[PDB]
């Protein structure tokens, strides 16, 4: 259900609920911690905008959709759907499952490369760096429990108007060469 897109592309998050309501809300969770309120749609409403946020709702099927237009790296988060029903006094707001959105940039000049970097402390430990690859490249998890490979990671060097992706791989095996770690 997770969702990876290129920045400037669009994103449709869907959501479904059981017992009918009078008010539906969307939130985003930042870095698996704090939630922030995004938009709110009444029971007698079809559509709403809040700049780049576009929300639809139907009480006919009990489902909702949020559209983000012209996406940014800052949109990366996890999106929660949240129904609100109450018998006047209370106001129990419930939360849905959640949908991870990652938004990646466009790499200007890809230069895919894998390097071995050695430990500053006199030891024999080393890591592998797969770096400077374009944003439609797959980093495959290892099919070898002795080999650890991280997920992808975008770093920004603003002073140079430059970005790059990376992933790291290391092992505990003896003589471990980077020459094949990663190989898709």
């Amino acid at each position: 259900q997770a969702l990876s897109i290129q920045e400037g592309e669009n994103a449709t998050m869907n959501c479904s609920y059981k017992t009918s309501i009078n008010n539906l809300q969307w939130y985003r969770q930042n870095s698996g911690r704090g939630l922030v309120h995004l938009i709110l749609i009444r029971s007698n409403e079809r559509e709403k905008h809040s700049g780049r946020l576009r929300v639809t709702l139907d009480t006919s099927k009990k489902s909702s959709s949020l559209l983000i237009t012209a996406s940014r790296a800052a949109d990366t988060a996890s999106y929660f759907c949240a129904p609100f029903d109450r018998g006047s006094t209370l106001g129990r707001l419930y939360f849905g499952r959640g949908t991870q959105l990652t938004v990646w940039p466009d790499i200007q000049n890809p230069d895919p490369a894998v390097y071995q970097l050695r430990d500053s402390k006199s030891s024999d430990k080393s890591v592998c760096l797969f770096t400077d690859f374009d944003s439609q490249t797959n980093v495959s998890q290892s099919k070898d429990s002795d080999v650890y490979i991280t997920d992808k990671c975008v770093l920004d060097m603003r002073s140079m108007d430059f970005k790059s992706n990376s992933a790291v791989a290391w092992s505990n095996k003896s003589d471990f060469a980077c020459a094949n770690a990663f190989n898709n």
Binding site: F95, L117, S120, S145, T150, C153, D156
Partner: protein, 244 residues
């Protein structure tokens, strides 16, 4: 004007009393406690309509809430068990209309209760120097920091160039990975990256420190083992630019 909860992280043993603080200065009447597992879903455990109102939620835990002042909504766990390991999120709201409703949220406390304290381990930290092959072909230098063998989950990694923290050119894994995925009590690893210009790394007078802040045992938590007590602590590795 925000909504603050303390502490950000907590690891304790079983059978201990926990109080999670939550305060707000916006002056709202309604406050809420939500719990969220590494399952992914949010669940309502407590809410208050105001001072002298406390109410059980959707799913019943063994915890208690108190509301003696509009600002504070503390939450107590009288005895801790591993069953309690989760994230606890505090929220608030208003009762007047005009951009009506929606909750404000704290940042949460991430709590882990451990059965066996001998499972707790601080991280080892190492800094790997940028490849000279990279420098040659790219005129940039990428430092990698690696924190290994820690348990439980709760760390915060940062970079320090010449004594000041930096954010430009840094990337850190969104989440730790499990060193032994099939084990309940598996220890974790985490990597970071810091990219600078080659001329900067090649200045022998620059100084680089990867710092890992670890949340762990408390000063007094019992401990009868030979390794040093895995208390909350900071573990660093450092490296110097190499004139070339």
């Amino acid at each position: 004007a925000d909504i603050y909860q303390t502490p950000r992280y907590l690891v304790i043993g079983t059978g201990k009393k926990i109080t999670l603080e939550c305060s707000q200065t916006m002056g709202h009447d309604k406050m809420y406690w939500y719990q969220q597992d590494p399952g992914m879903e949010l669940h309502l455990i407590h809410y208050s309509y105001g001072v002298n109102s406390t109410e059980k939620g959707d799913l019943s835990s063994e915890s208690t809430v108190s509301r003696i002042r509009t600002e504070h909504f503390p939450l107590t766990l009288e005895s801790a068990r591993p069953s309690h390991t989760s994230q606890y999120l505090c929220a608030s709201s208003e009762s007047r209309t005009g951009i009506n409703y929606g909750y404000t949220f704290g940042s949460g406390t991430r709590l882990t209760v451990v059965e066996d304290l001998n499972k707790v381990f601080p991280p080892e930290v190492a800094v790997f120097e940028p490849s000279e092959a990279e420098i040659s072909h790219t005129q940039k230098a990428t430092l990698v920091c690696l924190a290994t063998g820690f348990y439980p989950d709760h760390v915060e990694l940062s970079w320090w160039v010449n004594g000041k923290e930096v954010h430009s050119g840094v990337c850190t894994d969104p989440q730790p990975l499990k060193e032994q995925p099939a084990l309940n009590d598996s220890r974790y690893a985490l990597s970071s990256r810091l990219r600078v210009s080659a001329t900067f790394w090649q200045d022998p007078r620059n100084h680089f420190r990867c710092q890992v802040q670890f949340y762990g045992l408390s000063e007094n938590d019992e401990w009868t083992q030979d390794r040093a007590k895995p208390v909350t602590q900071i573990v660093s590795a450092e490296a110097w630019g190499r004139a070339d």
